[PDB]
Amino acid sequence: SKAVIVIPARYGSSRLPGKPLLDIVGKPMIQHVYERALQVAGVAEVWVATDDPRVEQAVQAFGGKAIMTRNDHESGTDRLVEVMHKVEADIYINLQGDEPMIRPRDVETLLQGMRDDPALPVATLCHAISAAEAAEPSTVKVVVNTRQDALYFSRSPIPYPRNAEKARYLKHVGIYAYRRDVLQNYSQLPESMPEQAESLEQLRLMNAGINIRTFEVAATGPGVDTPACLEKVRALMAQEL
Amino acid sequence: SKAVIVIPARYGSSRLPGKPLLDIVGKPMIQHVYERALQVAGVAEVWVATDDPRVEQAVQAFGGKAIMTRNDHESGTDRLVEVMHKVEADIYINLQGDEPMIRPRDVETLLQGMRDDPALPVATLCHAISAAEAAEPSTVKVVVNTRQDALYFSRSPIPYPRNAEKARYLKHVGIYAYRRDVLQNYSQLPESMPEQAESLEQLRLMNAGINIRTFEVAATGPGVDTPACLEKVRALMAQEL
Ligand SMILES: Nc1ccn([C@@H]2O[C@H](COP(=O)(O)OP(=O)(O)OP(=O)(O)O)[C@@H](O)[C@H]2O)c(=O)n1
Ligand SMILES: Nc1ccn([C@@H]2O[C@H](COP(=O)(O)OP(=O)(O)OP(=O)(O)O)[C@@H](O)[C@H]2O)c(=O)n1
Ligand SMILES: [Mg+2]
Ligand SMILES: [Mg+2]
Known part of the structure; x- marks a missing residue:
């Protein structure tokens, strides 16, 4: 492997x-x-x-x-x-x-998931977030079942906060582990309605019944799109040492 | 059967x-x-x-x-x-x-789905709705894949309208078709977190990996919850005669 x-x-x-x-x-x-x-x-x-x-x-x-x-x-x-x-x-x-x-360990966790279950098409990461963080559409939420298999991915805060106290959110860390075969029969994948509406490409796999398992890790540091946080990256990067 | x-x-x-x-x-x-x-x-x-x-x-x-x-x-x-x-x-x-x-035919369409696929655990119904309607937390939305399998059930407008012209919605017509075996192992199923937040019992099935297929139908008549709806149906059913 x-x-x-x-x-x-x-x-x-x-x-x-x-x-x-x-x-x-x-x-x-x-x-x-x-x-x-x-x-x-x-x-x-x-x-x-x-x-x-x-x-x-x-x-x-x-x-x-x-x-x-x-x-x-x-x-x-x-x-x-x-x-x-x-x-x-x-x-x-x-x-x-x-x-x-x-975090090199997060990646190791991801690859380990793939190894622990050969039949798993795709693996990805997630981490807990406040319902305050789950409000921002730039942030992507994910909901999973007992087996940690993804149910759906959205920009809407899911699950809906009816009995708000019982609500628990998970941000989705955009890293993926693909099974060679998945990538091979991928270009044949047609864009899905949710995909285009949500503007979330991973939903093209769910449209096709291709299971994606999630793996939880600790609140991960900031990405690099907003040059504002880009100072926090440098500040955290520089501090990290 | x-x-x-x-x-x-x-x-x-x-x-x-x-x-x-x-x-x-x-x-x-x-x-x-x-x-x-x-x-x-x-x-x-x-x-x-x-x-x-x-x-x-x-x-x-x-x-x-x-x-x-x-x-x-x-x-x-x-x-x-x-x-x-x-x-x-x-x-x-x-x-x-x-x-x-x-509608007797809606149920037939439902029963037929179970019959056309013996391996199907549960079947339910849904029907198209505008985005203006999908906004109502009172209305349960559902999103599905190519085979019409449910991905998630929520009160939140899903799929989120990033590219609204691409966002098409489905209201969840709450009727069910259960394979005997499914009901036999039901009482053993533990309530899920997503089920508690959204207050949707069917989400206890999804948490357990028990597939639910959805079948589309035309917009259905309303049920009787409040006395306004009562007089609301009473009328409809009288003018139907
Ligand atoms: N056709 C593409 C699209 C994206 N990426 C890569 O995917 C990562 C993140 O993508 P994204 O967040 O969308 O950044 P951009 O593609 O540059 O678009 P934007 O700046 O608006 O986020 C980056 O490593 C980016 O270079 C890529 O190699 N080729
Ligand atoms: N303990 C219960 C709860 C519900 N039902 C039945 O399930 C259907 C729909 O239930 P629901 O959607 O929850 O409507 P209500 O519970 O009746 O809402 P309300 O309490 O406001 O009247 C009805 O036929 C109702 O009689 C039942 O037999 N026994
Ligand atoms: Mg980026
Ligand atoms: Mg009722």
């Missing part, structure tokens, strides 16, 4: 452009992710999937695996599919490039 | 005491439901599960079948399990006692 990590790092960014080559305390964001990916046990390879060369050059610079990919992809998942075709593996882990504060 | 129809009709009601016996165009509400259930093809038995002797009598009064049950039942569902033990069948259909405007 070989497993590899893939890190999508497009240059073009609607919000903050060239977001991956951004300097977070001496290193380019993308590098922080790479180094951390390298610390994950059980992984045979760590690849960065890029579309622009200013990234590929940046990556090779620190000696990272730089595989060039199409500059047309509408989503990460797609770009990952293209890499699944050239880099052989049983398990693919997709780590976003805008999260320089990922 | 024997299938029976169960109609829970407890005497009690926070706003319409005796409700099952309320008069709509000449007959007590419960009768309407019964007569309509009797029109459904493929059903071997139509039973009314009650908790009161006055409710029992009335049903015997017009030639219907009745069965007394624990007056301490907490829910129409838990009342059904008790009937599952006395009346043998492979499929159980639970029709509400406060919905005299049920």
Whole structure:
């Protein structure tokens, strides 16, 4: 059971452009992710999937695996599919490039889930959040059953707060562990109505009966989209040491 | 493949005491439901599960079948399990006692779904609704996959309208079709957190990985909850004549 990590790092960014080559305390964001990916046990390879060369050059610079990919992809998942075709593996882990504060142990937990249950198509992460945090649509909630299998993913605060005291929310940490086969019969997947309405690509798998299991971890640090928190990333990154 | 129809009709009601016996165009509400259930093809038995002797009598009064049950039942569902033990069948259909405007064909569509797939645990119904309606916490929304399997049931507008033009909604028509086995292991099922927050008992099935398939129908007539709705249906059913 070989497993590899893939890190999508497009240059073009609607919000903050060239977001991956951004300097977070001496290193380019993308590098922080790479180094951390390298610390994950059980992984045979760590690849960065890029579309622009200013990234590929940046990556090779620190000696990272730089595989060039199409500059047309509408989503990460797609770009990952293209890499699944050239880099052989049983398990693919997709780590976003805008999260320089990922926890190598969280990833290990994710990959362990895949290993503990071979029949599991996809694994992903989540963590508890206040009902105050579950209000913001930028935040994505997830609800699961006893087996931790995902029921649904939404921008709406689910479950609804009827008996509000009994409500418990879980943010969804956008990392995924895919079974090679899943990626292979993926391009054939048609976009679902919930997907397009919600603007959540993972719902394209649920539309197709493809089970996704969630794994809970501790409140994770901030991602990197808002240059405002970007100071907290640097401040937390810089402090972290 | 024997299938029976169960109609829970407890005497009690926070706003319409005796409700099952309320008069709509000449007959007590419960009768309407019964007569309509009797029109459904493929059903071997139509039973009314009650908790009161006055409710029992009335049903015997017009030639219907009745069965007394624990007056301490907490829910129409838990009342059904008790009937599952006395009346043998492979499929159980639970029709509400406060919905005299049920459509015999909708139930047939429901029973057919269970028959077309022996492996299906439970089947239910739904129907399209505007986003303006879906806003009401009072209305239970449901979202499904390509095979029409339910992903989640909530009072929150799901799917969330990120790209509203893509958001299409379904109101959950609360009728059920239970495979005998499902009812046999029901009392062992523990209440789920999502079920408690949203106050939706069907969510105790999903928490247990027990698939529920939804079938779409045309917008259904209203039930009898408050006396405004009572006069609301009374009218409808009279102008139908
Ligand atoms: N076609 C795409 C889309 C996304 N990504 C990658 O997926 C991660 C996060 O995606 P996202 O949050 O959507 O960032 P952007 O794609 O740049 O869009 P935005 O800035 O608005 O969030 C990043 O590593 C990004 O480069 C990618 O490689 N190729
Ligand atoms: N302990 C119970 C609870 C409910 N039911 C039956 O389940 C159906 C619908 O129940 P519900 O949706 O909960 O409506 P009500 O409970 O009657 O709402 P209210 O208390 O406000 O009248 C009705 O046929 C009702 O008689 C039952 O037989 N026994
Ligand atoms: Mg991002
Ligand atoms: Mg009612």
